Amino acid sequence: SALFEPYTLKDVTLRNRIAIPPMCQYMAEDGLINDWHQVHYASMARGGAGLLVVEATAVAPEGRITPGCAGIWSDAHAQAFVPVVQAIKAAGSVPGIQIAHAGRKASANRPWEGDDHIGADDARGWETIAPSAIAFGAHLPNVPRAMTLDDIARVKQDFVDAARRARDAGFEWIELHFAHGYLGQSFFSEHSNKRTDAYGGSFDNRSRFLLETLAAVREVWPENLPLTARFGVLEYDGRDEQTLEESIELARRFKAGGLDLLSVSVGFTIPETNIPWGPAFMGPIAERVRREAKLPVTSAWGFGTPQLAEAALQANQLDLVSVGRAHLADPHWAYFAAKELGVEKASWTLPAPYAHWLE
Amino acid sequence: SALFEPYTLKDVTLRNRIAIPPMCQYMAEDGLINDWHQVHYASMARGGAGLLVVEATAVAPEGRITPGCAGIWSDAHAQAFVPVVQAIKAAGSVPGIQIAHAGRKASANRPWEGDDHIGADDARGWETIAPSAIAFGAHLPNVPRAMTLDDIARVKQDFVDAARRARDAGFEWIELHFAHGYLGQSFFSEHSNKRTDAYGGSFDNRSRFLLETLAAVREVWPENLPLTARFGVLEYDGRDEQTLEESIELARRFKAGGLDLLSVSVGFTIPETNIPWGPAFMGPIAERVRREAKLPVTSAWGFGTPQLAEAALQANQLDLVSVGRAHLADPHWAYFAAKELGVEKASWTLPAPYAHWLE
Ligand SMILES: Cc1cc2c(cc1C)N(C[C@H](O)[C@H](O)[C@H](O)COP(=O)(O)O)c1[nH]c(=O)[nH]c(=O)c1N2
Ligand SMILES: Cc1cc2c(cc1C)N(C[C@H](O)[C@H](O)[C@H](O)COP(=O)(O)O)c1[nH]c(=O)[nH]c(=O)c1N2
Ligand SMILES: NC(=O)C1=CN(Cc2ccccc2)CCC1
Ligand SMILES: NC(=O)C1=CN(Cc2ccccc2)CCC1
Ligand SMILES: [Ca+2]
């Protein structure tokens, strides 16, 4: 089974091609993770996945999506992750983390508490920042303040400090969150970036925040550990041909800047889109990026069906298959997949106290 | 769905009829549980089961099955269980524990390390105790030391001490392990008990160790928390009609002695048996015990198929369905069962950070 072939990138070897993508839990308090996360992550790692990327973790307080989001903006926050790293490693999985800034989509309620921007009179809210003072719209109507040059420098340094802290907590894999309409994505998109300074108004200028942040992180992130990013390569906004071409060119510049792997996603930059959700629908898009930018890739959205994951690998569309919601449903999904694909000794995807009895 | 009806027994209410039965993990060191257990139990509790009975936990060091078995024979051992108890409760499940003494089946290898009695050369082994100096045979050839009256008094007191410790650790449900050929089962069975004193040679005498231990525990276990036991009611040894009659009579005596619920199992007292393993095969046996002894029951062995579990409840064969190995495979099995049975808002079997996204 292709799904259960190991993968080596820089000095890291994953025991199979199953990645658990970052999935926000909205259970942290003041950015500090806790027993929710400890058990959540440890149990999924014991489930058999080769790589577990911890949820979007804010580089600064205002870069949380919600009051429940994890953060890594202090040494105390980083220390909270050490036992998560240790539990993921002890299970034989590789610990990664996605570092993030929610930009104009920040200061929102948890998804089961409205999923919408926090109102001005709710004291839990905060002012958001973005390239330009333009709201997302729909359920996120709050207008962000347009970043100053000093804001840009500060946020870049927060990404650097977050990467340093992740490194020192023991993570072996980092992912910069430049997707899903949050701050990085919103610098790249002409929908959200109307700046006329060095950070807007041309392809080079829109790319600048992302490339400068990558370069700054590259200085502190060890060269022998995968340096990755998530990036929305189209929006399904009627501009897909031009947007995909620019996105692939940016991916080439990411490669030139030392990026080891790209997690290929959708922009979600604006609500006025027509995204064709369906099983493995990203597969052909990820393949195009992989081939044209000559970069390893992962993608997601529907690969909880083991045969879809296997097919995508065999077709050389992906190097790793990210499986999210199926692992919320079943933390041992990798074992389920091993069985479904007829892997020999499938139960030994799990640790012995389970594997012995499930043989 | 009958499976998702709450259940009340004494002061304890379970949110559904799914019990996770005790399942040895063989991961403790000198009886002390650790991060293996913490994550294992917390993750299953979050999976939705209403009751989680912690694995056979030895009342004394020589009462472990293996060098990896959990113990509760000191206050330090009991303190180690507190975070397990609390994590189970935090998840909305009820924490229980099975307290145990492996008798002549003690001093064995872990199941994936031979599953057999520890060899004489091997320095991990220990002397076993039993009602009579008779070996189980087959892969468990070690001859145990026959217990004196002073030994019997000591072991009963160890069970009492264990129950007090379990109480103070915060368990809300206790199960005395009088099944599966360990010490309690072996006092009841004429195969293993050849004593000629007050503890063997008649039905009353063979029952005595079990009734005295129950009565002793009842003195320290809170009256408002379920007091339960697991008991093998037949062996499939060609003596089933007589054995089942005696077992059901002892169940009546357990009820008269304050037992709140009986977990009905098989004896496993000797290897010379022919057990007809199959889906839900214990259902009719448990039903007969429930009906004839007029006591609530649970049973196990095959109910990982949600429809089998539901059917057993609707037939009034069981009050709780114990589902073991399916929870090793999938710690969120209770959610899987809710979906399979078409429960409304089935995903809210799980905590919000999962449920929201799975509906
Ligand atoms: C609960 C939850 C939370 C998040 C997500 C999703 C879900 C379900 N996803 C998107 C996720 O990584 C993945 O791309 C999608 O879930 C699609 O893959 P599946 O179809 O679920 O396997 C996500 N994406 C990301 O880049 N960072 C994150 O922190 C989050 N958080
Ligand atoms: C890993 C493991 C460990 C144990 C068990 C089984 C397994 C699989 N079982 C028996 C268990 O409680 C249950 O009766 C059986 O697993 C049958 O139910 P299932 O078919 O697995 O749902 C068990 N029984 C018991 O009374 N105390 C225990 O500690 C153990 N330990
Ligand atoms: N931190 C992120 O990148 C998030 C991505 N989301 C997109 C999504 C859309 C549909 C289904 C799941 C996720 C929402 C949750 C947080
Ligand atoms: N502590 C106990 O009561 C145990 C029960 N077992 C019986 C069993 C037989 C077949 C399959 C699973 C469990 C073996 C493991 C430990
Ligand atoms: Ca504002």
DSSP state letter for B56: E
B301 annotated as ligand-binding: yes
Q: If you take atom 2 of ligand 2, which residue's CA is the nearest one? A: B23
A7, A41, A182, A335: the active-site residue:
A182
Q: Are A35 and B355 in contact (CB < 8 Å)?
A: no
Nearest to A43 among B110, B331, B358 (CB): B331
E strand or H helix that includes residue B73: none
B345 touches chain A (CB under 8 A): no
**Disruptive mutation site among A43, A301, A336 for chain B (greatest number of B CBs within 10 Å):** A43
Q: Tell me which DSSP letter residue B29 carries.
A: B
Q: Contact at 8 Å (CB) between B334 and B322? A: no
Cβ of A111 and B27 within 8 Å? no
Determine the residue of chain B that is closest to A356 in CA distance.
B112
Give me ligand 3 centre to Cα B352, in Å.
15
Rounded to whole angstroms, the Cα distance separating A332 from B80 reads 26
The distance from CA A140 to its chain's CA centroid, rounded to whole angstroms, is: 21
**CB–CB contact A111 B25 (8 Å):** no
CA B101 – ligand 4 centroid, Å: 14
Contact A244, A233 (CB under 8 A): yes
Whether B354 and chain A come into contact, CB under 8 Å, resolves to: yes
Interval between CA A137 and ligand 5 midpoint (Å): 12
The verdict on a CB contact (< 8 Å) between B39 and A39 is yes
How far away, in angstroms, is A206 Cα from ligand 1 center? 25
Q: Which residue puts its alpha carbon closest to atom 16 of ligand 1? A: A324
Active site residue B7: no
B86: tokens are 């609390």
- For B265, phi then psi, to 5°, come to -140, -165
Q: Cα separation of B165 and B168, whole Å?
A: 5
Strands B7-9 and B12-14: antiparallel
Q: Alpha helices of chain A — where are they, by DSSP H?
A: 35-46, 75-90, 149-169, 183-188, 203-218, 240-256, 283-293, 306-314, 325-329, 333-340, 352-358
CB atoms within 10 A of CB B126: 15
Q: Output the six-digit token pair for A226.
A: 């995968």
Nearest-by-CA chain B residue for A346: B329
Contact yes or no for A89/A95 (Cβ under 8 A): yes
Q: With an 8 Å Cβ cutoff, is A353 touching chain B?
A: yes
* Nearest-by-Cβ selection for A354 from B328, B335, B356: B328
Domain boundaries, chain B: 1-359
CA B320/CA B313 separation, integer angstroms: 7
Alpha helices in B219-277 (DSSP H): 240-256
**Chain A residue whose CA is closest to B24:** A353
Q: Which of B328, B354, B357 sits opposite A358 (nearest CB)?
A: B328
CA distances from B126 to A149, B60, B165, B270 (A): 72, 12, 24, 21
* CA trace torsion B283, B289, B291, B294 (10° rounding): -140
| Cα distance between residue A183 and residue A177, in whole Å | 8
Resolution, given in Å to one decimal, reads: 1.6
Give chain B positions within 8 Å (CB) of A110.
Answer: 352
Rounded to whole angstroms, the Cα distance separating B196 from B201 reads 6
Residue whose pair of structure tokens reads 């999904």 in the numeric block: A333
Q: How many residues does chain A have?
A: 359
State the catalytic residue, choosing from B182, B236, B335, B354: B182
On whether any CB of chain B is under 8 Å from the CB of A48, the answer is no
Closest to A159 measured CA to CA, from A252, A227, A104? A227
Pairing of strands B129-130, B94-100: unpaired
Largest CA distance in chain A: 64
A61 touches A107 (CB < 8 A)? no
User: What is the C-alpha separation between A142 and A133, in angstroms, rounded?
Assistant: 10
Residue A42 touches partner B, C-beta closer than 8 Å = yes
Chain B positions touching A43 (Cβ under 8 A) are 39, 42-43, 331
State how far the Cα of A251 lies from the Cα of A265, in Å rounded to an integer: 12
A106 in Cβ contact with A63 (< 8 Å): yes
Q: Tell me which residue in B26, B332, B354 faces A353 most closely, judged by beta carbons.
A: B26
Considering every ligand atom shown, identify the ligand nearest to the alpha carbon of residue B24 and give its number: 2
Q: Which residues have a Cβ under 8 Å from the Cβ of A298 and sit 6 or more positions away? A: A19, A21, A261, A262, A263, A264, A286, A318, A319, A320, A321, A322
Please report the atom of ligand 2 found closest to the CA of residue B25: 1
Strand A129-130 relative to strand B18-20, pairing = unpaired
Query: Can you tell me the distance from the alpha carbon of A207 to that of A121, in angstroms, rounded to the nearest whole number?
Result: 36
Rounded to a whole number of angstroms, the distance between the first and last alpha carbons of chain B is 18
Buried b (16+ CB within 10 A) or exposed e, A293-327: bebbbbbbbbbbebebbbbbbeeebbbbbbbbbbb
Ligand 1 atom index nearest CA of A180 = 26
The SS3 call for residue B305 is coil
C-alpha Rg value of chain A to the nearest Å: 19
CB-count exposure of residue B85 (10 Å: 0-12, 13-18, 19+): buried
Q: Whose CA is nearest to atom 8 of ligand 3?
A: A180
- DSSP character string of A314-348: HTTS-SEEE--HHHHH-TTHHHHHHHHTT-TTGGG
Burial of B158 (0-12, 13-18, 19+ CB in 10 A): buried
Write the DSSP symbol of residue A43: H
Range A1-359 classified under CATH 1.20.120.160: no
A89 to chain B nearest CA, in Å?
A: 13
Of B39, B325, B330, the CB nearest to A332: B330
Question: What is the distance between the alpha carbons of residues A158 and A144, in angstroms, rounded to a whole number?
Answer: 19
DSSP 8-state symbol, B331: T
- Backbone dihedral angles phi then psi of residue B256, each to the nearest 5 degrees: -65, -25
Closest CA of chain B from A304, distance in Å: 13
List own/partner pairs for B42-45 with CB under 8 A and 24 or more apart: B42/A35, B42/A39, B42/A43, B42/B84, B42/B87, B42/B88, B42/B90, B42/B91, B43/A39, B43/A42, B43/A43, B43/A331, B43/B331, B44/B20, B44/B327, B44/B331, B45/B87, B45/B88, B45/B90, B45/B91, B45/B92, B45/B93, B45/B95
Q: Does B203 touch chain A (CB under 8 A)?
A: no
Identify residue A38 by its one-letter amino acid code: Q
Tally the C-alpha atoms within 13 A of residue A278's C-alpha that lie toward its C-beta: 6
Q: Are B206 and B258 in contact (CB under 8 A)?
A: no
Asked if B87's CB is within 8 angstroms of A39's CB, the reply is yes
User: From the list A329, A331, A357, which residue is nearest B358 (CB)?
Assistant: A329
Who contacts B47 (Cβ-Cβ below 8 Å, separation ≥6)? B327, B330, B331, B332, B333, B334, B335, B349, B350
Nearest-angstrom CA–CA distance, B303 and B63: 29
| Gap between the Cα atoms of B114 and B48, Å rounded | 34
A174 SS3 class? strand
Closest chain B residue to the Cα of A112, Cα to Cα: B356
Residues 64-103 on B with a CB inside 8 Å of A are 87, 90
- Distance between CA atoms of residues B261 and B226, nearest Å: 8
Residue matched to tokens 């997949």: A337
Distance between CA atoms of B142 and A344, rounded to whole angstroms? 35
Q: How far lies B24's CA from each of B41, B100, B148, in Å?
A: 12, 11, 29
CB within 8 Å of chain A, chain B residues 103-122 = 110-112
Answer whether B38 sits within 8 Å of A36, measured CB to CB: no
DSSP string spanning B186-213? HHH-TTT----STTSSSHHHHHHHHHHH
CB contact under 8 A, B357 and A111: yes
Best CA proximity match to A338, nearest among A330, A351, A347: A347
Interchain CB contact of B355 with A (< 8 Å): yes
Map residue A236 onto helix, strand or coil: coil
CA distance B270 to A299: 55
Comparing C-alpha atoms, which of A32, A162, A7 is closest to residue A94?
A7
- Residue A348 touches partner B, C-beta closer than 8 Å: no
Instruction: Compute the radius of gyration of chain B from its Cα atoms.
Output: 19
φ/ψ (deg, to 5) at A34: -155, -165
Determine which helix (DSSP H) or strand (DSSP E) holds B162, and give its type and residue range.
Answer: helix B149-169
- Minimum CA–CA partner of B339 in chain A: A329
Three-state SS at A48: coil
Q: By three-state DSSP, how is residue A71 classified?
A: strand
Using a CB–CB cutoff of 8 Å, tell me whether A340 touches chain B: no
Q: If residue A99 lies in a helix (H) or strand (E), which one and from where to where?
A: strand A94-100
Quote the ligand 4 centre to B299 CA distance (angstroms). Answer: 13
CA of A179 to the centre of ligand 3 (A): 10
Ligand 3 centroid to Cα of residue A111, in Å, is 10
